[PDB]
Amino acid sequence: IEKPKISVAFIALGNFCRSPMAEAIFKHEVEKANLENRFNKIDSFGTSNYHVGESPDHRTVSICKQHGVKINHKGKQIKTKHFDEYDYIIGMDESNINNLKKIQPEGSKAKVCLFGDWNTNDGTVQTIIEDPWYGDIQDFEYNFKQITYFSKQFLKKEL
Ligand SMILES: O=[N+]([O-])c1ccc(OP(=O)(O)O)cc1
Numbered sequence: 001i002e003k004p005k006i007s008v009a010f011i012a013l014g015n016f017c018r019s020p021m022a023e024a025i026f027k028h029e030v031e032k033a034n035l036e037n038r039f040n041k042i043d044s045f046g047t048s049n050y051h052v053g054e055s056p057d058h059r060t061v062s063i064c065k066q067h068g069v070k071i072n073h074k075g076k077q078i079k080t081k082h083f084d085e086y087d088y089i090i091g092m093d094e095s096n097i098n099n100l101k102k103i104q105p106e107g108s109k110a111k112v113c114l115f116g117d118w119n120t121n122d123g124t125v126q127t128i129i130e131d132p133w134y135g136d137i138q139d140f141e142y143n144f145k146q147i148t149y150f151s152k153q154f155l156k157k158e159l
Pocket residue numbers: 012013014015016017018019020046131132133
């Protein structure tokens with residue numbers, strides 16, 4: 001087939017604040033655009049195992065609920081083997097990218113990229129989805145705006 005079903009994995013450090021939000025929003029945008037048929041797996045993970053088994057940060061959940069975006073997730077860690085199970089392994093910031101590239105096996109199919117690679121750079125949003133941990137609910141809302149923006153760009157540019 002010329003239009004293969006795509007598998008996407010969103011990565012952050014804890015799979016607690018940003019990546020579960022990225023997965024939730026991306027699935028939401030796929031559904032709104034009736035593009036389910038173009039995707040196999042859409043998941044989120046963390047480079048660390050610090051929040052394995054836990055539901056997302058209450059602030060990420062509150063932001064998703066405020067926008068009417070469903071979210072249901074338990075923390076999980078990205079592994080070297082996953083690089084052959086996903087077409088895109090998308091990090092939030094450069095520190096995520098650094099770690100992913102160091103565990104990326106040679107020849108694996110996944111393309112490691114920054115979600116912000118899909119930014120238009122037209123000034124609407126910043127490219128790096130910054131860790132909101134030490135910030136507050138506004139930083140989480142901004143991550144939501146960034147992720148929604150890149151999700152729509154990704155759907156328009158990669159399919
Ligand atoms: O404690 N922390 O610094 C911390 C913990 C979990 C986080 O979640 P992430 O956005 O999925 O990496 C982000 C930051």
